[PDB]
C-alpha cells in the first residue's frame, strides 16, 4: 500500500512540510528570535534580503515525499536542484534530516543552533544564497539556468541502483540547454545505468513573467514531454490536503515503473528504449507565503519570486504581516522547548546514509578511484631522428584511450560531439563502440559502431556533453572529453561554473573530497583550416580560461604526438584542476622519443638541444614556440637562419605548460625568476610564435624581467579560405616571417641580414602567388623536415 | 490546381533539380572543362577538396518548388539555410536564376562563367564554403549551427508579407539552441509578422552518427513538434519521380495554411495562436552521387556528408566514377552550346526582385529608415550640483526607450531576457507592452503587460533571444538588447559569428548595404551582486568582446545617469558595430548635465574639471576610472586624499569609451600620442580604477609612451557573499585601497603619508568588521557624495 498513505502519516509529512517552510522563511528573513519566543522587532530582521522564496515551498514539497519513499522502498536518491535560488529549502531540509548538524556543528538542533543556522543564511561570512558547494548534497550550483537535467544523467551514469530526482523550474525549461538535455534519456542504458525522475516544477511564472510551459495547453504540454521520450504524470492543485495524496501517489507509482523498466532490462528479456516517467508540478508559486501585500497578489504570481515583502524594518504594517507569516505554520507544534524537531518529525527521518543530503554520490570524491593507467610508453612511436620522421598525432592518444577504455569499464568514459571519428580516434572503437540506446539498422553495423554498451558518448548538443561529464566527475568517476577548438566558445559559461566549483570546494569547503580532474581536448585547431567548422575560427577560449587562476585550470600545448601521450597520461591522474589540452590531428613531424616527451612534460618547458645553435656560447635570440603548427614554423625559421647565417647561434625553447610564464608570485607552478631568465635570457630578444592571440603570453610573462624582449606572434585574423601556409603568412607566423623577425631584432644583423631579408620577402610573394594558381602549398612545403 | 502538377512541368522541375545538383558537384571538384566537353582528367579537378556534398540535394529540393510556388503564388520568401555547408547548392541555384550573374559580372552565365564559377568555389582568393555574406540572398552564416531557426523568426518579426522557408538539418536539432527556438512561434503575431515555415531535413545521419531525430520513433517525432506548437507534415522517399508529387503537394497545402492564418488573424475574427504548418523530409543525404565507393554504402549514409571520394587525383578509377557521376545529370540537355540553362529552364526561374537570391530583404541595408529618435535632453536628470544629486540610473533611460518606441511604431523591438522590469525599464510598458501571444489570465494585467501587439521580447532563453535581434537588423530594423552581465557568456558565441559577419561584409563584400549596429546593455554589474545572477559573476565578456578588433566591436561605461543617455542616443544611429553598454541599475551618484554628458561622450574621454584638483599645474597623480561604481571609489580616494594632503594636485579622468586608449595606429578612432599624453600626463603615475579585469587596460594602452607608469586597479575575484564595500575591498578596487595606491606611487608622499596609510588601513579594517556584524555597510558609506 505504497500509494496510499495513512491519515497520521500524512499528518507526520504535513509537519515536516511547515517545519521546512518555517525555516525556509526564517533564513530570508529573521536573524535572531528564531522560535518567535519573543514578538518579532526590527532588530531581529537581516538588513539586507536576499534570499529567493518563490521556489521554496515547492522543492521542499518533493524532499518530504521523496523521503518517504526512501524509508518505505530503501531507495537513494541525490535530488539534484535546478532553481538553486531554492538553497533555503534544501539547507531547512538537511538540517532537519540532521545531516547539516553533523556536517557542521555549530549549527546544531537547538534554539542557539537555529539562531545560528539563520543568521548564516545569505550573510556576509557566511553561506551563499544559491546551492554553493557548502551545500549538502549537492552537485549543482543552479546559479546559471540550463544545465540541471544534464548534470542528473551524468550521475546515474553508471550508479545501477542510483535514482536521481532532478526539479525544473518552467522558467530554466526555457533556456536551450536544458531544451536538448531531455533528449538525454536516448543515451541512458536502463540495464546499467541508473534511472533519472525529472520533476517539473510549473509554478507558472517566472521573477516578472508567465512562463513558456505554462501559457502552451495541457494537451501541447503532455504531447511534448511524450515526444522527448518519458511519459508525463500531472499533479496540480494548491490545497496541501489534496496534493500530498496526489503527489504521494504519483511518486509511488513512477518508482514502480522505473523499477520495473530496470527490472526488465537487467533481465535481459526487453532491451529497447522504455518511456521514463515524468512528473509535472502545477503548485502555486510561493504558495504558503501571504496572499495580498500591497493590494497585489502574491501567492501563485511573479510578485513571490525572492522576497515577497522586502521593506519590512521601515514598515511595521509589513512587519507584522511577517510575524503573521511565521506564526502560520504554528512553531509551538513542530519544534520542543530546546528547540530540536519534536518526535514525531525526528521518526520520518531517514537513517544514516539514505539521507539525500548525506548521500556519499553527492560527495563523490569519496568514491573515487584512481584510473588503472596502462604503460603509455608502448603506444609511443619511434622518433630515431627528432624532426624527420612523420606519423599522425591523434592515432597513439586513441589507441592510448582504447587501453583506458578496457582497464577501466565502468568508471571511465569518453564524450565526444560527433567527432571522435574526424578527431581520428577510432582505435578507440576497437573495444567499445557508441551508445545509441535507439532503434538500429543493418547498414549501422557496416558503417558506424553503436551499440546499448557504449563507453564513449556521442551529440551534437556541446551543452548537454558537457553536462553529462561535469556530473559524472562530480560522482567520482573519470573522463576525457575530445572536441574542436573552434567550437569551444560553446561550453564557455559551462567551464566558467565548474570552475568556479572546484575554486571554493578546494578552498572554502574542507569536507568536500578531491573529484576528478576535468580533462578537455581540443584539436583541428585554427591554423589546418579543415573542411568541418566555420572558416573564421578563434583561439579565443584559450585566453577566456586563463583569466581563471592557474590554480583551478592548466593548458597544455603539446608539440607531436609523444607529448600529447605524456600529457594525456598525467592529467588523467590529477584531481582538481580544468585541463586543456590544445593538439592537432594532422599528420605531423614527430620530435620526442617516448623518454624525452616525459622529461619535456615534467619540466613543462625545455630547450631543445637538437634545434639549438650552439651550446657553451650564449645565444644571439632565443626562438620559442607553444602550439605544434607554430612549432614547426619555428624550426623552418631556425632552418633558414642556421643555413643563411652560419655563424649566428639560436636557442630554441619549446613550451608546453603555458602557466609556466606566470612567476613563481602569482603561483608556485610557476617557473622561478632564476629558472625563466636562465631559459630566456636576462638581454636577448625572444621570438615567440604561438598559437593563439599573441597578447596571451605577454599578460603571463608581465611580470618577468626580460618581458620588455619578448616579442610574441600569433593569431590575428582568418581570411574567408587560405593554404595552411597562405593562412600564417596572414598572420605572420611564417617561417619566412619569423626569419625576418629575427634579423630585425638581432643587432648585428641588421646591415647584414639586408639582402637576406629581400629573399625570404620574395619566397612569401613566391608562395602566395603559387597558392592562389593552384590552391595548394608547393610540395617542399608540406615535406619540410629538419635538414640538420 | 495547385497541389498537383503537370507531368510537363514536373519535368522541368527536374531538370532544374539535376542542373542544380549538377553546378553542386562541379563546384566541389571540378576546376576546368565545366560542360565535360573533353574527357575528364586529374589537371581538371581541384588539388584540394573542402567542399560538403550531403547535404546538397536537399537543399536543392526544396529550393526548386519553393521557386514554383513563387511564380504560381507571387509570395515572396528568403530561404534561411540551417545546414550552412550546404552552400554549393544555394549559389547553383542562385547561378541558374541569374542572381549570381548580375551580382557577380563575372561569373556570367556560359561556359567561360561556368568555369569561372566552379574555380572559385573553396579556393584560395575564392569564396568560403559555408553562407558567408559573399553569398547572394543569405542572412545566416550557417557555421556554427543552431541559430538557423531563430533568424529565420527574427527575419519576419516585422514583415507582414513575408514567409521565411528555414530549412534545418536534423543533425542541427540536437544543439541546445535549435531545441529552444522553436517555441518561438509563441512570439510570432499572425496579425502583423510573417510567417516562418521551417523544413527539417531529416537526412538520418551527421558527419559519422545517426542523428537523434531520425532515430526516433515516427510517432514519437509527430508528437514532439505538436507539443512545440507546430502541425506537422511529412515528405518521405527516395524516388525523385515520387517526391516530386509529394513534396509539391505538401508545400501547396502548407502555404494555404499560413496565408488562411494570417488572414483570419488580420481580419480580427480569430486572435488565438494557431498551429503553424511544418514540413519533415525523410529524403536519402546525397541522394544522387555514388552508390557505393570502396564497398560501402555511401548514398544515404554518414559517408555521403562532404566528399563522397577525397581521393580523386590519385586514384583513377575514382576520377571515373566521379565522370560517370557527372553524366548521370546529363548536362548535354541541361546547357545549350554557349553553356547557359536552356530556354525550359529559364522559363520556370521567378522574375525581377521576386527570386529567394534577389529579394531585397536577405540584403536588409537597402530597406533600412533611419530611427526617428527624440532629443534625449527631454529625459535628463537635472545635476544643480556635480556628485552630489543622487538619482536612478535606468530610469531616464527606460523613458527615452518609451520614446522610441512611441514614435517608431514598426522598426523597433526591445529584447530583454525576462528581466526588463527588474533592469528598472518599466516606463516602456507606459506605451506598449510585452508581446505573448499564450493563453492568459486576469491576474496577468494586474500585474504584467502581456498584449499581442507588444513591442518587447521577453523569453528567458538568450540563444534564441539574441537570435531574434540579429535577424532583426540584418533585415534592416533597429533594436536594444538589455540584459545582464552575469549571462552575457551565453550569448558568447553568437556574438562572435555576427562580428564576423558585420566584418566581411563591411570590408569584402562590396553590395551589402550597412545594416543597423547591434546594441547590447549590460545592466547589475558584478560589483553590486544583487539578488539576481549567480554569486561569481564575471565581467569577461567585455575581455572576449575585446578581441575583435575596434572596427566592428565599441565598449561604452557610462558613469552616470545621463551619460548612460548619450550613449544610447549615439549608439542608436550607428550602423555596422556591436556596442556594448555596460550600465548600473543602482540608484547612483550623478555627475554631468545634460550638455556636460554630450560633450564627454563625443570626446569619449576627458578631465572632470570640478573634480581634478589644481589646473594651471603639473598634477602629481592622475586618478582616472572607466566604469561608474568604480567612479564613485575613485572620486572617494580622490575625496580622501585633498581633505588629508591639501597640497596634493590631482588629475582626475575618466574614459567612456574603453577603445579611445587604443593608439591612434591600432585604429583611427583611438586617441592620437599627443592627445592621449596631453590627458594622461607623460611622466606621473596613473592610478586607474576598471570595472573588469586590470589586465584589459595593459592590453590597449601598451603601446603608449606612459604605459609603464600605468597602475590599474580591476576585478580579480569574487567571495561567496558581500556587501557593496566588501566587494571592493577584496579587489582592492575600495576608496581607501585607492588612496594607499597613490601614497605608495607619489614619489613625495611615501615619507609624509606614512601615518594617513595608517589610518586608512584601520578603516577598512573597521568596515570589515561591521559588515560582518551587521550585514550592511555603515551609512555614511551610502550615502556619500562629493564634499567639494
Ligand atoms: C540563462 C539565465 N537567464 C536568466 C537568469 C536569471 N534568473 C535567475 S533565477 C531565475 C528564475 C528562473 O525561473 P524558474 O526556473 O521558473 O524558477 P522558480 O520560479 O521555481 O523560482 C532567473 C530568470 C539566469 N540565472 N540564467
Ligand atoms: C555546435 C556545433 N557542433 C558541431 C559542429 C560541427 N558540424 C558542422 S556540420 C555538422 C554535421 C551536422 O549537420 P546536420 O544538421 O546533420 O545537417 P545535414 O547534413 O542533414 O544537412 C557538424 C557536426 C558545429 N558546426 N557546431
Ligand atoms: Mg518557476
Ligand atoms: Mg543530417
Same mark, same amino acid.
Given at each position: 500500500?505504497?500509494? +496510499? ?38 532588530? =531581529? ?70 539562531? @545560528? ?83 517539473? =516544477? ?31 504524470? $500531472?499533479?496540480?492543485?494548491?490545497? %496541501? ?6 503527489? !504521494? ?7 514502480? #515503473? ?25 503548485? %502555486? ?8 501585500? #500591497? ?5 501563485? *504570481? ?11 524594518? +521601515? ?58 593507467? %596502462? ?13 624527420? *620522421?612523420?606519423?599522425? *598525432? +591523434?592515432?597513439?592518444?586513441? @589507441? ?48 558506424? =559502431? ?86 573564421? @575560427?578563434?583561439?579565443? $577560449?584559450?585566453?577566456?580560461? +586563463?583569466?581563471?587562476? !592557474? ?84 624550426? !623552418? ?11 649566428? #647561434? ?33 638581454? #636577448? ?38 593554404? %595552411? ?41 613566391? =608562395? ?19 635538414? $640538420?
Amino acid at each position: 500500500d505504497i500509494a +496510499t498513505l495513512s491519515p497520521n502519516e500524512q499528518a507526520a509529512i504535513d509537519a515536516w512540510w511547515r517545519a521546512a517552510n518555517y525555516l525556509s522563511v526564517g533564513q530570508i528573513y529573521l536573524r535572531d528570535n528564531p522560535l518567535l519566543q519573543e514578538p518579532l522587532r526590527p532588530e =531581529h530582521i537581516k538588513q539586507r534580503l536576499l534570499g529567493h522564496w518563490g521556489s521554496d515551498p515547492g522543492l521542499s514539497f518533493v524532499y518530504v515525499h521523496l523521503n518517504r519513499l526512501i524509508r518505505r522502498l530503501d531507495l537513494n536518491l541525490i535530488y539534484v536542484t535546478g532553481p538553486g535560488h531554492g538553497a533555503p529549502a534544501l539547507l531547512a531540509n538537511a538540517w532537519l534530516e540532521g545531516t547539516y548538524s553533523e556536517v557542521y556543528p555549530n549549527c546544531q538542533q537547538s534554539t542557539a543552533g537555529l539562531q @545560528q543556522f539563520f543568521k548564516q543564511f545569505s550573510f556576509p561570512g557566511g553561506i551563499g544564497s544559491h546551492c554553493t558547494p557548502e551545500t549538502p548534497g549537492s552537485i549543482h550550483e543552479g546559479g546559471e539556468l540550463g544545465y540541471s537535467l544534464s548534470h542528473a544523467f551524468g550521475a546515474a551514469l553508471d550508479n545501477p541502483d542510483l535514482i536521481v530526482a532532478c526539479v525544473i523550474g518552467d522558467g530554466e525549461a526555457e533556456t536551450g540547454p536544458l531544451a536538448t538535455s531531455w533528449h538525454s534519456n536516448k543515451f541512458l542504458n536502463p540495464a546499467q545505468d541508473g534511472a533519472v525522475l525529472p520533476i517539473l =516544477h510549473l509554478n507558472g511564472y517566472k521573477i516578472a513573467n508567465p512562463t513558456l510551459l505554462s501559457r502552451i495547453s495541457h494537451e501541447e504540454l503532455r504531447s511534448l514531454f511524450i515526444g522527448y521520450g518519458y511519459e508525463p504524470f $500531472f499533479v496540480e492543485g494548491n490545497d %496541501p490536503a489534496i496534493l500530498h495524496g496526489v503527489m !504521494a501517489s504519483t511518486l509511488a507509482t513512477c518508482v514502480q #515503473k522505473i523499477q520495473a523498466i530496470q527490472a526488465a532490462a537487467r533481465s535481459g528479456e526487453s532491451s529497447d528504449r522504455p518511456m521514463w516517467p515524468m512528473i509535472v508540478l502545477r503548485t %502555486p508559486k510561493g504558495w504558503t507565503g501571504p496572499a495580498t501585500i #500591497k493590494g497585489h497578489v502574491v501567492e501563485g *504570481s511573479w510578485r513571490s519570486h525572492q522576497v515577497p515583502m522586502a521593506d519590512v524594518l +521601515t514598515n511595521p504594517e509589513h512587519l507584522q504581516l511577517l510575524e503573521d507569516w511565521l506564526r502560520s505554520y504554528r512553531p509551538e507544534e513542530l519544534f520542543d522547548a530546546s528547540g530540536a524537531p519534536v518526535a514525531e518529525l525526528q521518526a520520518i527521518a531517514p537513517i544514516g546514509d539514505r539521507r539525500m543530503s548525506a548521500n556519499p554520490v553527492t560527495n563523490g570524491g569519496l568514491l573515487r578511484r584512481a584510473l588503472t593507467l %596502462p604503460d603509455f610508453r608502448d603506444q609511443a612511436v619511434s622518433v630515431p631522428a627528432p624532426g624527420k *620522421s612523420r606519423a599522425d *598525432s +591523434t592515432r597513439p592518444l586513441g @589507441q592510448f584511450l582504447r587501453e583506458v577504455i578496457r582497464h577501466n569499464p565502468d568508471n571511465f568514459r569518453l564524450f565526444g560531439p560527433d567527432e571522435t571519428a574526424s578527431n581520428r580516434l577510432d582505435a578507440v572503437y576497437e573495444v567499445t563502440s557508441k551508445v545509441w540506446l535507439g532503434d538500429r539498422i543493418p547498414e549501422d553495423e557496416d558503417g558506424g =559502431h553503436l551499440s546499448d554498451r557504449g563507453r564513449v558518448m556521442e551529440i551534437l548538443s556541446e551543452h548537454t556533453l558537457e553536462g553529462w561529464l561535469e556530473a559524472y566527475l562530480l560522482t567520482g568517476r573519470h573522463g576525457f572529453f575530445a572536441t574542436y577548438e573552434a567550437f569551444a566558445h560553446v561550453i564557455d559559461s559551462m567551464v566558467n561554473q565548474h570552475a568556479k566549483w572546484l575554486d571554493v570546494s578546494k578552498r572554502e569547503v574542507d569536507w568536500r573530497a578531491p573529484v576528478s580532474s576535468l580533462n578537455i581536448l581540443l584539436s583541428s585547431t585554427v591554423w589546418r583550416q579543415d573542411h568541418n567548422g566555420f572558416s573564421h @575560427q578563434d583561439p579565443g $577560449f584559450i585566453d577566456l580560461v +586563463t583569466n581563471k587562476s !592557474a590554480r583551478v585550470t592548466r593548458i597544455y600545448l603539446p608539440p607531436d604526438a609523444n607529448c600529447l601521450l605524456s600529457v594525456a597520461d598525467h592529467c588523467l591522474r590529477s584531481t582538481d584542476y580544468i585541463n586543456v589540452i590544445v593538439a592537432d590531428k594532422q599528420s605531423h613531424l614527430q620530435y620526442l622519443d617516448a623518454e624525452a616527451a616525459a622529461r619535456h612534460c615534467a619540466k613543462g618547458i625545455g630547450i631543445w638541444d637538437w634545434a639549438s645553435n650552439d651550446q657553451g656560447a650564449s645565444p644571439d635570440v632565443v626562438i620559442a614556440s607553444c602550439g605544434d603548427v607554430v612549432t614547426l614554423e619555428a624550426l !623552418a625559421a631556425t632552418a633558414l637562419l642556421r643555413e643563411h647565417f652560419p655563424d649566428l #647561434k639560436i636557442r630554441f625553447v619549446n613550451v608546453v605548460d603555458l602557466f609556466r610564464l606566470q612567476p613563481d608570485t602569482e603561483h608556485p607552478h610557476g617557473l622561478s625568476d632564476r629558472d625563466f631568465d636562465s631559459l630566456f635570457t636576462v638581454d #636577448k630578444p625572444i621570438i615567440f610564435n604561438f598559437h593563439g592571440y599573441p597578447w596571451l603570453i605577454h599578460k603571463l610573462a608581465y611580470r618577468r624581467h626580460n618581458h620588455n624582449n619578448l616579442h610574441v606572434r600569433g593569431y590575428k585574423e582568418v581570411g574567408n579560405i587560405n593554404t %595552411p601556409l597562405e593562412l600564417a603568412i596572414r598572420n605572420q607566423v611564417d617561417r619566412f616571417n619569423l626569419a625576418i623577425d629575427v634579423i630585425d631584432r638581432v643587432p648585428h644583423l641588421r646591415d647584414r641580414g639586408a639582402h637576406v631579408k629581400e629573399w625570404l620577402k620574395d619566397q612569401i610573394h613566391d =608562395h602566395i602567388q603559387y597558392a592562389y594558381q593552384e590552391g595548394i602549398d608547393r610540395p617542399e612545403i608540406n615535406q619540410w623536415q629538419w635538414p $640538420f
